[model samples]
Target: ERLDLVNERDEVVGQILRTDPALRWERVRVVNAFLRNSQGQLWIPRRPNALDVSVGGAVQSGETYEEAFRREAREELNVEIDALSWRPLASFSPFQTTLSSFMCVYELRSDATPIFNPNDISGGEWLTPEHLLARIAAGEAAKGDLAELVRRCYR
Candidate 1:
């Protein structure tokens, strides 16, 4: 596993193995998405309990953001999201947030429910914006750049 090493502006400066310790300092792009149902509630998964977040993973080398998002969706949920269902949601930069060098957050609204992989996700829940905020505020759902994404979306 390798990722393109990037700068604060997300320029590909070089490449490094995903296991490289240098990644701790270098900037890299991470892609993620928020899936919402027709009822407007976001889908969330209960992970290893130690880890927390909605659902997402890192962008592989030479992969487009959408490709990464779709790939991650397939891997995590065991279902593929139709390209037509996705929309650009937000772009968080290093200067804007500590999530990553840059995180491309996409939005996918689907009426069909997602079947998450049991190995990937122990369990999950659907929450609206208000409920999600309360959970985060109460320390129930706190992981990665979710707080930042929620704050950005809710605002």
Candidate 2:
């Protein structure tokens, strides 16, 4: 559901939340892992002072979501693992960014870091579980989505 505010020439001048729906996708092999730092703290992306989910570009036209998943994993985290690395855990589609949904939640491994693509992710900070939970409560750390991912997988 890609949309934009455009001019007379059909040129996109601005964009806003698209209210349409995405074509239904039956099989998505992408992985959305909940990462944990050395201290068991999850790594979240917050630009300045806002919460943001760490996701990648959209599934290209004519390309399978599975392909997009592997590419996204490499580009975003640099970690390499076979299909087994990603096991479908859950689904959450809100008729928005997900189009379909954040369809996969794989296990995040400590071993995945050494090969992490530092260039893409920049850097990350560590946090203990308690500390992270406190931050979440105080509106500082990862949001409920990520926190829930961790809770489901870790517990």
Candidate 3:
């Protein structure tokens, strides 16, 4: 792991490599999506002025990303989640952290209704396909788009 260092004069730092991950994108970000049930469909998890993704969590040390995600789901929703696929949809890091330069996305879906837990999730709501997009458009809805993969996978 090499780093660039300069003096008060701001002269040439230590060896300038064409590519230095410390100065470049160099993190592994893992993401999960929480889609809700199909039903009468009013946005779930309505928090005063917001309704959003079902659940999400960042990966932690001493555990794999998928493991962290399952833990998050369990903590937030009180359910054990098994993802359909941990595949990329789209990604951009608005605030890049040193450890995580690229986000590894996974489309999230579950066949079972979540068991409620108030800690990670105060509560959650279900959104329909139509309302789902509308929510995202309104800055109120999100999931990594596991449903899209569900479509591609089962078809």
What TM-scores do the predictions have?
0.89, 0.51, 0.48
- Candidate 3, residue 58: Cα displacement in angstroms equals 1.1
**Residue clash pairs of candidate 1:** none
The Cα local distance difference test for each model comes to 0.74, 0.46, 0.45
Model 2 root mean square deviation, Cα atoms: 8.9
Q: Lowest summed-lDDT stretch of 10 residues in model 2?
A: 22-31
Q: What is the C-alpha RMSD of each candidate to the true structure, in Å?
A: 1.9, 8.9, 10.6
> For residues 1-155, could you state the per-residue lDDT of candidate 1 as single tens digits?
88877777788888788898767533777877788888988887776652344558877889888888888888887666774477888887877666655778888877666778888688777888788777777877466567677778657
State candidate 2's TM-score. Answer: 0.51
Cα lDDT for residue 16, candidate 3: 30
Model 2 lDDT at residue 153: 50
Clashes of each: 0, 0, 5
Off by over 4 Å in 2: 1-31, 36-58, 61-65, 83-86, 93-102, 112-120, 126-129, 141-144, 152-155
Q: Which candidate gets the maximum TM-score versus the true structure?
A: 1
Q: How accurate is candidate 1 locally (lDDT)?
A: 0.74
Tens-place lDDT per residue, model 2, 6-106, is 33332335433333353323222224654554565555555234432343444443444456666666677665536333444454443333333334454
Superposed by TM-score, candidate 2 places the C-alpha of residue 35 at a distance from the truth, in angstroms, of 3.7
Off by over 4 Å in 1: 50-53
Clashes of 2: 0
